[PDB]
């Protein structure tokens, strides 16, 4: 799980998804090019999402990464620094620990919040 959670980490904290082996819960179109379509890979999801809580989590996770992707695109930066919104998101060290308990929910909320605060700062003031 180390690589999977690494892939996830970057998606959630940087909006960076690099999935040459198609493992990830999501992917997009466009491999001008702004009409990005998004896809949910139901078959590789961590949670089946037949429950409201998991559906809500899934979408928050997608938004997190999407908001970050937009910021990177607007700023034309490869990465969003730790010196941006003052939220530190630790790496996933243990996948199972993240799956255990509502750790995804809090982890993602932190991630989401960072994506959201950064996004909002730029959109409102920039």
């Amino acid at each position: 799980s180390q690589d999977y959670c690494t892939m996830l980490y970057e998606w959630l904290t940087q909006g960076i998804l690099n999935d040459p082996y198609q493992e990830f819960m999501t992917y997009d179109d466009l491999e001008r090019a702004w009409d990005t379509q998004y896809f949910i890979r139901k078959d590789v999801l961590l949670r089946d999402c037949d429950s409201e809580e998991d559906k809500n989590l899934l979408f928050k996770m997608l938004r997190t990464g999407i908001l970050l992707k937009v910021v990177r695109a607007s700023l034309q930066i490869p990465t969003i620094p730790s010196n941006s919104s003052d939220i530190t998101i630790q790496e996933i060290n243990d996948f199972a620990d993240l799956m255990e308990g509502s750790n995804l929910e809090l982890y993602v909320d932190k991630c989401y919040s960072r994506a959201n605060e950064i996004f909002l700062k730029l959109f409102f003031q920039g």
Binding site: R32, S74, K121, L122, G126
Partner: protein
């Protein structure tokens, strides 16, 4: 910095400006290179050459 492209179907769609003015919020010369300068020259020729007949005159 609002350069739009007019399409023949009447739609005018922004392009080359696909950025929020590239504002960075938290804080350098827009010069032209050789081909860009050459392009400006050819652009001129196009602007007049591509401008009822010329023979009405």
């Amino acid at each position: 910095q609002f350069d739009l492209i007019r399409l023949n179907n009447g739609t005018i769609e922004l392009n080359g400006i696909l950025t929020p003015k590239a504002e960075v919020l938290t804080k350098i010369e827009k010069t032209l290179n050789i081909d860009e300068l050459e392009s400006v020259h050819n652009t001129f020729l196009t602007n007049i050459l591509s401008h009822p007949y010329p023979t009405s005159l």
